[PDB]
Design a binder for this molecule. Structure first.
Ligand SMILES: Cc1cc2nc3c(=O)[nH]c(=O)nc-3n(C[C@H](O)[C@H](O)[C@H](O)COP(=O)(O)OP(=O)(O)OC[C@H]3O[C@@H](n4cnc5c(N)ncnc54)[C@H](O)[C@@H]3O)c2cc1C
Ligand code: SF4
Ligand code: SF4
Ligand SMILES: [Mg+2]
Ligand SMILES: [Mg+2]
Lengths: 424, 616, 158, 158, 616
């Protein structure tokens, strides 16, 4: 047969490796657009700090790795798809044919429509060229202004603060990390960050950025409240949207993300999708949602490649898991951390210690754990995923978990790994 | 070297916990954990202050082998001046607390003064702080440990605390760590509770470095473990039967007191022995014993785990005692059992649960209960005063008295005074079975003479763990001798006391002496510490420790008049058994002991032995 | 020819003698809080259960790593962390459903059991033989033998 | 319409004709070390007993899988392993209290008795008829009839 | 094809066990397991070498149908130059060891040289290595098997070892695997122990792949098993009674030797037969037989399981022999029984247990004991030399002699020399009942004429398995003949020897020849191996194997002057039974046998017959 894969991130690499392992008598083509070997963008911040070189961001470092597995590497950007007679038209004028297709094109950042946002000193942080420009401009002692206080915004502000410059954060919302933390933990993170020496102004937006007499001096940014800030470099971390630029006039159904079923497959027989572009069913209810994280990309790529080769594999669902390091503080969140309506039988617990920077919260919908959120907990923090993903029927232990929420590993052992080791 | 070179020295009157270096040239003369702590006490306090007051002092200490790879290396000590006796008190406990103290960077803690408000102490590797504990006062040990662990958000914190029997200042309170492991004797809990100190909590993440020779130490420990694995006593007897195996063995010989030293044999001793803990109960068809557990680093695992019946009349209306906790040791089973005449097994476990929950001492409590029951049977105590009938062999009376004494309500307020003071209050001092204020352990001294001599000449009142001559006359592990003879006993007592002092100072369990010897203990200390640790130095250390303890004890006021026994043990012949018609002969062995020890006829060290041991 | 650790939790006494060895070999100091095998105690029933890594075949930790710092050893069949390409991004610690690979802040890296390259030191220091190093296939032969002896009653006393 | 295996250990000679058939039916090569039924010999009493999975209804192996690669069958009432969803995490070999469902390091999955979709191969190769395939209910008819004949002593010679 | 194409070739002098491909073009001319091993031996050694020396060699081999689905396919062989006879020795053993060697990946092991230190071999599928065994020298077979299995932590390892008689170099030692089912006869244990090798341990998980036709082989075996399941002998007789059932039958014909071939009928033969095993003992009311067992893949299961009485004087004070072990075969019961006039079953069981434990041969031991009894009864041997009275019918003497021979102390040393050398030492060579150094099996040659010739012209000594003509003169399964004529006997012997050679070379049990035939063995070999395997090829292979063995034996120094019998058999008439006044008439059959075989009258192959078989 013949398999053609678009995009060479984690998803494409894992899918190609699994396809080569499964069916050793096929042709595999892997495509990309950037002028670099397959690399993770996740390790861009540590390039900014100076811990590693650029070559340390590569996904596979063993020399000549994509030859022993007989995988063909090409270059080109897909611009047109013809699903009726299975044709792909690239930008360079050449053409390719296929038998099975996998779409793993990822996402791209979005810019707010602010006047003067295309000035040379306004950069995003998504690729290697942006990292090079930021490194060129962020000399020690410079002036930096950043937009957004989300997740990637927190990572970038941590990296830039470690680089050793002044920092200012403008957030349009009400608190920091509003999508992965409760307000109390957000307040703790805010006060810790302000103590460490980073100025944060909240509940405000950017009105306009204006240029001075020459492109050697910094810029003048006027906020919504009225005050003006002089800043050499401006970082934009608004948000990201999926890469869908050739599926608009095809019978492939496309919402905000590409829609798939439990075994990854779009609404055409012979086209598959995985990564940041796929919209997959939820674990709790069953709706479609997009989660842009690394374990999701790995698992979806493996399942899609296994189903595409001819076998039959199934996916359980998707889940949002996050871990964050900010200037020496480690925090994490799992699942439906915001709880649920009490009239349907839920319960929760929250333990807080302010002067020592400690927090923990547990939520139970009906005899099963549903979400968790913690600050400073690092040992055996993976067992929460085991308790949430596989819905363990806690039973009596539920009451115990309401009085001391630090015995989740003990409950997991006594309920779903060795239930008969305690029988006497 | 096994020492970590740091002391804490907190000042309970105003806080101010400030570190301080350890004193070398004292470490290589007493070896630590029984001689270093008592030297620190003796060299800076006075022997005349009353037991409970602000002017007193308390020391917590560990040993050089504590928290290392050596077998049974997890023991720690508490040193103070006992309020029950008036002598110097040193209590030893196991568990996982001394190891955690050693992993945190310290190896000694000194408490002095008195705090105006209740507080508790917290240590994290450099950061020791005092915190308000006004919400823990009046709660038992288990709730205190659970509340501290839940508040500080860490399930690996090691906690030591007192109960309600320390706050009320019962004369025989104790310190309990890790639920069922505990110190005891001489009422150290009263001294802890007189300072408004509630609990100590330790968390340690630094490790034990500083060994002069690592591979030699590892090889020595590995070679020494084989000898312990080979002996039948420490390979099949202890792990399978606990210390309860001695019940029938002592009962057959006719050396088991019963009903306040009125008999020398118990008819129901087969009902509370070790075999009764392995039989399937008729109601549920399951034994009381579940498994066994071990202290830190121990490779013998002599502990007990027991489950109480759910249909017994004492706990059938209470659902908070239905779990699994610690079992019965030999002394507790004797004191709650044959000392009163109670043949039930569930009542003993219930009383042990109460004693572990509220922090008391089973031996002193059982002996005092037996004395009170004898007084009631004679006629001095009436029903109206007690509020309850107390005949011999009544389990309900034992349970009721245990509840009243632990909760400190009613006649228990008298019961908590102790057998000596309670007997003196009612004009009958001859009915107290004690020497210098502490009641006798589970061995009778009519059929055995070395135990009588060991009781009469011990440095902290009547204790059987200072000089243990049963191991030569019953088990006979070095040699088998005759327990009916009074020839060659003083040298036995002297050698055993010296060996026990060295073992206690080393920082390891004493039970390993059933298979080890000083030959098997010297190489590990030599490879672990700095200096010349030969055999002569070890013998000199033992003698020096004993002589310095005797000097401190003698300076405080106690003299040769206190080396006596109650008239019942020296004028009442035995009634039945192999030792029928025998009486103790302490008068024929004490002058020989004074002669062979090198002291005066009145029990005072001479300048010759003081100059020989370098005590001047 | 691969082998694995077998854990029998009915024989453990909670002496923590194995954590000392597992920490001394890898750090050089005795420290039962930096070991890679843990022991959990259940007090209401009186049981103790050791806990370590099972060395998965399609392990989540190997696939989740973004910088290729975890690799398989063909001789002994274990996943090993190369602590010179790792950057301490901690994404491998939330993507393990049992939570055995953990984070060490003294050096700023991660750690997990690596079978000591075919020479476990935790199995040599255990006195009660509750940890064994046996072949990967047929790890349940003892239980099969015991239950075959127990269930299949003999044709006697009847 | 459900059926189960009956094992009778009083008619076994230890010829190991079960394991060759069970291994050949699944792997393609004769290999008694990769079968899912095992014969244990107790020499001191002169007894031989074969053992295999009993297909529980409160399955421990079913409820401990984090990916749901084990599910029930309704035709034969047999638990199955779907060997392209399993990831070889080896947790299912710890939860089972009887010792069955084991690992296979050559392919990287686990294995247990699946009743061969209602056509057992081990029950056809036994010459002594010590393994039988009967209906799930009423497995005690053969012993009950013999004991009814024997226990009731006749009214003869009395 | 049934072969795996690999040989080991270990060098005991310096280790270095290095693999090597199998030699095809010899496998399709000898079929393996009795021709391939001896072809290797003949082609790479010299016949003039002494039996035990480093220059000797030892070969372990299996067959093409070893470890497959075919019935009874689990047998292996050991080939060397025997020390008891001086001719070529081939021993056949069953159990579970040959199948495990087949599953490991190899199908032949060659030992050459002598090791300076005691070692043993360990094999896992690609990895063979020699390991020290100095802590195993001087232990029994059971103990070394259990020790290896416990030390390696694997209950699926197969072990083959020797006892104390192998180390002491007793001339009739053997090799035991799986606690019974051993080799024997020509003393291969002495050769194994002279090479300073203790045991072989093997564990295989690779599987027997490579059969040229899977469905054809499966169908052929399924059809072949149906014939074996309908024959009355191999469906009800052998599984229920075993090989012992023959005893009474032979006794009814008056062809059973008794008391060193002095009689032809035993009066107590009904007390050691199979029915005597099926009866209940008055002491306990339970029979001596428990159940039967089977070798690897066998569907007949003619084995035995027995338990010894607990009140017999031999084993009354030794609780080590109270378990359940293998039962009595026919030849062990004859040699320990009727050969000495002993009618006690428990003594026979104890002697067989000792022989199995220490690794000896019951037939040679029993014959040597009988010769010693006759020598004592004559008057040459005095009670002072032996140390005990040795009359006929003494069970106690038999037990003591068994213990002495097993441990090799005192007179047992002399008993370790065999019957022929012992008789020659005292100047009575006429009392040794042996041909070429091997004693006689349990078939008399006066009431049977074919077995006299069969004993006279066998290639390894007095053996009854090379040519078995009792199957026609007693049971008569091919054709019922008359055992009182000598007409048409040479053709019988020739055909039976050729068929037996083919059966042994194939790799299956020979008992299956009671229902099977060459026509039922051809399809399985044809569907398993590759090439042309027809009936003519099988006949040619059998004849070639026999001729090559005879040629090697001739080149070793043995000729036509050793084909004789003791004077007692050919000169002394019978004294009872239906064969009255009959003596052997071997002198009227030997020239016919030489002529029919196509040999020179002096017993050398002619160039015509040598060229016909391609042996030149
Ligand atoms: C803890 C955590 C921290 C993170 N930190 C960061 C961070 O600091 N910065 C960050 O940017 N992300 C960060 N992420 C996000 C994460 O690194 C990626 O968003 C995602 O995991 C990559 O998955 P993917 O392969 O589907 O996307 P991608 O790796 O983006 O895959 C898209 C690939 O396809 C190529 N492509 C694009 N268009 C085409 C086309 N038309 N034809 C062919 N190929 C095409 C692209 O060049 C790219 O190589 C973080 C995630 C987590 C969980
Ligand atoms: S090994 Fe496979 S079947 Fe067993 S629990 Fe893990 S994923 Fe499930
Ligand atoms: S017939 Fe007897 S000796 Fe031959 S293989 Fe079968 S059980 Fe073994
Ligand atoms: Mg204590
Ligand atoms: Mg044989």
């Amino acid at each position: 047969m013949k398999h053609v894969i678009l995009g060479n991130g984690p998803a494409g690499v894992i899918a190609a490796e699994t396809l080569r392992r499964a069916a050793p008598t096929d042709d595999i083509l892997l495509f990309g657009s950037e002028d670099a070997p397959p690399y993770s963008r996740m390790a861009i911040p540590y390039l900014l700090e100076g811990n590693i070189d650029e070559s340390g961001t590569w996904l596979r470092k063993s020399p000549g790795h994509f030859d022993r597995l007989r995988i063909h590497e090409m270059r080109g950007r897909a611009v047109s798809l013809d699903s009726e007679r299975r044709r792909i038209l690239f930008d360079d004028g050449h053409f390719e044919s296929w038998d099975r297709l996998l779409i793993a094109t990822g996402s791209h950042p979005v810019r707010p429509p602010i006047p003067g946002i295309d000035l040379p000193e306004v950069q995003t942080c998504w690729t290697l060229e942006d990292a090079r420009a930021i490194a060129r401009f962020a000399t020690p002692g410079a002036r930096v202004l950043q937009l957004g206080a989300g997740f990637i915004g927190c990572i970038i502000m941590e990296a830039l603060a470690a680089r050793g410059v002044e920092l200012t954060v403008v957030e349009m919302g009400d608190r920091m990390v509003p999508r992965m933390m409760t307000p109390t933990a957000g307040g703790m993170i805010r006060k810790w960050v302000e103590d460490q020496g980073v100025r944060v102004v909240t509940n405000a937006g950017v009105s306009r950025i204006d240029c001075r007499a020459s492109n050697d001096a910094p810029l003048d940014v006027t906020l919504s409240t009225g005050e003006v800030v002089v800043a050499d470099l401006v970082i934009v971390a608004a948000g990201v949207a999926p890469n869908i630029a050739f599926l608009e006039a095809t019978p492939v159904h496309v919402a905000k993300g590409v829609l798939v079923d439990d075994r990854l497959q779009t609404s055409v027989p012979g086209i598959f999708a995985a990564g940041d572009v796929a919209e997959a069913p939820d674990l709790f209810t069953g709706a479609h949602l997009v989660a842009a994280i690394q374990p999701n990309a790995a698992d979806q790529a493996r399942v899609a490649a296994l189903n595409m080769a001819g076998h039959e594999a199934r996916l359980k669902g998707v889940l949002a898991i996050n871990v964050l390091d900010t200037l020496g503080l480690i925090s994490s969140s799992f699942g439906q951390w915001w709880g649920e309506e009490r009239e349907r039988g839920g319960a929760g617990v929250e333990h807080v210690d302010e002067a020592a920077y400690r927090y923990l919260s547990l939520q139970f919908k009906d005899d099963v754990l549903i979400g968790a959120t913690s600050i400073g907990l690092t040992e055996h923090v993976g067992a929460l995923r085991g308790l949430i993903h596989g819905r363990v029927r806690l039973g009596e232990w539920k009451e115990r978990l309401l009085h001391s929420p630090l015995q989740f590993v003990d409950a997991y052992i006594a309920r779903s790994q060795q239930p008969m080791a305690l029988v006497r | 070297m096994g020492w970590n070179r740091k002391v804490l020295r907190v000042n309970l009157a105003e806080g101010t916990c400030t570190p301080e270096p350890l004193n070398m040239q004292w470490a290589d003369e007493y070896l630590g954990s029984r001689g270093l702590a008592t030297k620190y006490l003796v060299s800076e306090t006075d022997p005349k202050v009353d037991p409970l007051s602000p002017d007193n002092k308390m020391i917590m200490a560990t040993g050089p082998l504590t928290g290392t790879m050596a077998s049974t290396g997890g023991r720690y000590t508490v040193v103070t001046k006992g309020p029950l006796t008036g002598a110097i008190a040193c209590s030893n406990s196991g568990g996982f607390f001394g190891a955690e103290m050693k992993f945190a960077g310290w190896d000694m803690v000194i408490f002095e003064g008195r705090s105006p408000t209740p507080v508790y102490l917290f240590i994290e590797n450099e950061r020791a702080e005092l915190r308000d504990a006004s919400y823990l006062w009046g709660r038992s040990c288990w709730e205190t440990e659970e509340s501290i662990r839940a508040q500080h958000q860490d399930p690996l914190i090691r906690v030591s605390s007192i109960g309600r029997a320390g706050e009320n200042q019962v004369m025989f309170a104790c310190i309990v760590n890790d639920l069922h492991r505990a110190a005891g004797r001489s009422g150290v809990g009263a001294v802890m509770g007189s300072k408004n100190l509630k609990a100590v909590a330790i968390r340690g993440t630094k490790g034990v470095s500083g060994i002069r020779d690592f591979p030699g130490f590892v090889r020595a420990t590995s070679e020494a473990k084989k000898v312990l694995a080979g002996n039948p006593v420490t390979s099949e007897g202890l792990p399978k039967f606990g210390t309860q195996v001695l019940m029938n063995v002592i009962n057959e010989m006719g050396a088991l007191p019963t009903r306040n030293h009125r008999d020398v044999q118990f008819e129901d001793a087969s009902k509370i022995s070790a075999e009764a803990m392995h039989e399937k109960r008729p109601s549920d068809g399951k034994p009381q014993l579940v498994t066994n557990a071990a202290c830190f680093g121990c490779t013998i695992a002599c502990g007990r785990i027991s489950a109480i019946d759910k249909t017994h009349f004492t706990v059938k209306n209470n659902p908070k005692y239905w779990g699994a906790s610690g079992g019965l040791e030999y002394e507790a089973a004797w004191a709650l059992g044959a000392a009163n005449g109670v043949g039930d097994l569930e009542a003993l476990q219930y009383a042990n649960l109460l004693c572990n929950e509220q922090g008391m001492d089973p031996i002193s409590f059982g002996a005092t209960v037996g004395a009170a029951m004898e007084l009631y049977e004679t006629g001095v105590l009436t029903k109206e005063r007690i509020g309850l009938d107390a005949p011999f062999g009544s389990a309900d009376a034992l349970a009721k008295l245990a509840e009243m004494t632990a909760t400190g309500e009613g006649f228990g307020k008298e019961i908590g005074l102790g057998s000596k003071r309670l007997c003196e209050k009612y004009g009958h001092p001859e009915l107290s079975m004690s020497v210098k204020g502490q009641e006798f352990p589970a061995y009778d001294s009519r059929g055995i003479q070395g135990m009588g001599l060991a009781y009469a000449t011990s440095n902290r009142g009547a204790c059987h763990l200072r000089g243990y001559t049963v191991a030569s006359e019953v088990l006979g592990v070095p040699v088998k001798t005759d327990p009916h003879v009074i020839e060659g006993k003083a040298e036995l007592v002297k050698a055993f006391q010296d060996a026990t002092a060295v073992f206690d100072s080393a920082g390891i369990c004493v039970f390993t002496s059933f298979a080890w010897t000083l030959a098997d203990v010297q190489p590990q200390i030599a490879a672990a510490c700095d200096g010349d640790w030969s055999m002569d130095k070890l013998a000199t250390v033992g003698e020096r420790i004993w002589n310095m303890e005797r000097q401190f004890n003698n300076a405080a006021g106690l003299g040769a008049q206190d080396d006596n026994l109650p008239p019942r043990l020296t004028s009442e012949p035995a009634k039945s058994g192999p030792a029928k018609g025998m009486v103790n002969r302490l008068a024929e062995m004490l002058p020989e002991y004074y002669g062979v020890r090198g002291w005066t006829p009145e029990g005072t060290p001479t300048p010759e032995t003081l100059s020989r041991l370098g005590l001047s | 020819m691969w082998k694995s650790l077998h854990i029998d939790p009915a024989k453990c006494t909670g002496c923590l003698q194995c954590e000392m060895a597992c920490s001394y070999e890898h750090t050089g100091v005795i420290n039962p809080s930096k070991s890679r095998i843990k022991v959990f105690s259940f007090e209401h029933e009186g049981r103790k259960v050791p806990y370590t890594c099972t060395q998965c075949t399609e392990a989540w930790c190997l696939h989740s790593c973004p910088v290729d710092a975890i690799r398989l050893d063909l001789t002994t069949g274990a996943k090993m962390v190369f602590e010179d390409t790792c950057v301490g991004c901690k994404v491998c610690t939330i993507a393990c459903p049992f939570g055995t690979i953990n984070y060490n802040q003294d050096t700023g890296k991660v750690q997990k059991c690596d079978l000591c390259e075919g020479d476990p030191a935790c199995a040599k220091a255990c006195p009660t033989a509750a940890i064994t190093y046996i072949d990967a296939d047929w790890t349940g032969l003892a239980r099969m033998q015991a239950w075959a002896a127990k269930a299949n009653t003999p044709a006697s006393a009847a």
